[PDB]
A = this chain, B = another copy of it.
Amino acid sequence: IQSDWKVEKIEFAKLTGERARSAGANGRIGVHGKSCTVDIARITIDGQTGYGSSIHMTPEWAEDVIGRRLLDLFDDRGRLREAYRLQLEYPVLDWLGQRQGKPVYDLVSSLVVPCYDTSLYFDDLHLADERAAVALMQEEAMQGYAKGQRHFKIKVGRGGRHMPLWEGTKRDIAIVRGISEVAGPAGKIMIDANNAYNLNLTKEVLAALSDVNLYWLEEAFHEDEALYEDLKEWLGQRGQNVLIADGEGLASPHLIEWATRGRVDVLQYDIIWPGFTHWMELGEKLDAHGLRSAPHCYGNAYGIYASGHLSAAVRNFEFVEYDDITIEGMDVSGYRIENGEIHVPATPGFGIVFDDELVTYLINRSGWSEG
């Protein structure tokens, strides 16, 4: 990177699409829907462009950044400075890989990465018949299986808000078993309560699912060291191997410490916020402790492909959280799902080919430009 290279232009557009199947409610909130959008920035440095997720960026913010040198955005250690990450880390890393003919997984390290189908929401809430609910949710897993998914995360916590407490929990249990039989003994099964349980409700559910191949338990309740210590001990005594997964949203400031003390196994900070640069630094610390990395990704299709590249820099990388989404102007065909794995194309940047012309249109129409 020459001191000659500088931020010449920054453009912003919101891209829109849909996920393949509408997502229902989860433990804590209502229907998530089918409509999807991705905020993107196009950065121009040395007459060449880079593309990527961009959040927390205003026209007035990019205004102040035009003219600065690329080198000045990096550490005296080689890390994009906290001040630029959420706004530009993806457009910048994509630029570097284009200019260098390298995929980003190279710059940071064929790439094949485990992935799970995260789309199994409360899609059964209109059905009173527990059997029909199971058949509905099984058929949803199937759709995912047919597209090459082998591992599934199932939303649970129906009884927390959206259904009567005990009836909902019975329904949870029935849905998980019923999906376990679609996945087969080799399919990994995760469950996510979105905090809708408490410790004893959790224990009851876990005990009812002794048969099932439960890979991890995600957000049973808001992270609490005392509660997770108890839960880990209870699982061990029963010889029940289920990983404890947490970390998305407004996480406890002490979550990682708790994990270093064996209370949490899987950390799940979001792939966009705190993001890619953060995750590389984090993945190193967690690797050192033998802890596992599984970045949260939902509501942002771009994060899916970011996660994939990320894995090359993280030894203990668990899964790419997958949602099947088509974003107009964002060609992700370089990627393919096969037997529970996503194959990351070995092309420059993040291997996504944006429709330059459509993007220019959306910038003009509903976005903005500085430079």
Q: Within the complex, what minimum Cβ distance (angstroms) separates A199 from chain B? A: 5
Give the interface segment out of A33-41, A156-164, A273-281, A319-327.
A156-164
A254 proximity list for chain B (CB < 8 A): 250
* Interface presence of A10 (CB below 8 A): no
Binding stretch for chain B, among A67-75, A224-232, A338-346? A224-232
A110 within 8 A of B: no
Whether the pair A200, B161 counts as a contact (CB closer than 8 A) is yes
Say whether A197 faces chain B, with CB atoms less than 8 Å apart.
Answer: yes
| Chain B, Cβ-Cβ closest to A157 | B198
Check A200–B168 contact: CB distance below 8 A: yes
A112 at the binding interface (Cβ < 8 Å): no
Residues on B with C-beta less than 8 A from A157 are: 198
Q: What's the nearest-Cβ distance from chain B to residue A61, in Å? A: 21
Does A189 sit within 8 A of B, measured CB to CB?
A: no
A168–B168 alpha-carbon span in the complex (Å): 19
Residue of B nearest to A252 (CB): B250
Nearest CB of chain B from residue A23's CB, rounded to whole Å: 16
Chain B residues within 8 Å of A185, by CB? none
Kindly provide the distance from the CB of A13 to the nearest chain B CB, expressed in whole angstroms.
28
**In-complex Cβ contact of A198 among B198, B226, B253 (8 A):** B198
B165 near A227 (CB under 8 angstroms)? Answer: no
A160–B252 Cα gap in the complex (Å)? 20
Known A160-B198, A160-B199, A250-B254; judge A29-B226 contact (CB<8 A). yes
User: Which residues from chain B contact A161 at a C-beta distance below 8 Å?
Assistant: 198-200, 227, 230
Bound: A230/B197 CA distance, A: 17
Residues of A whose CB lies within 8 Å of any CB of B are 28-29, 157, 159-161, 164-165, 168, 195-201, 204, 221-222, 224, 226-227, 230, 250, 252-254
Instruction: Identify 17 residue pairs between A and B in the complex whose beta-carbon atoms are under 8 Å apart, listed by A's number.
Output: A28-B224, A28-B226, A28-B227, A29-B226, A157-B198, A160-B198, A160-B199, A160-B200, A161-B198, A161-B200, A165-B198, A195-B222, A196-B198, A198-B201, A221-B222, A222-B222, A250-B254
| Given A165-B200, A222-B222, A250-B253, 10 other A-B residues pairs in contact with their CB atoms under 8 A | A28-B224, A28-B227, A29-B226, A160-B198, A161-B227, A161-B230, A165-B204, A195-B198, A196-B198, A221-B221
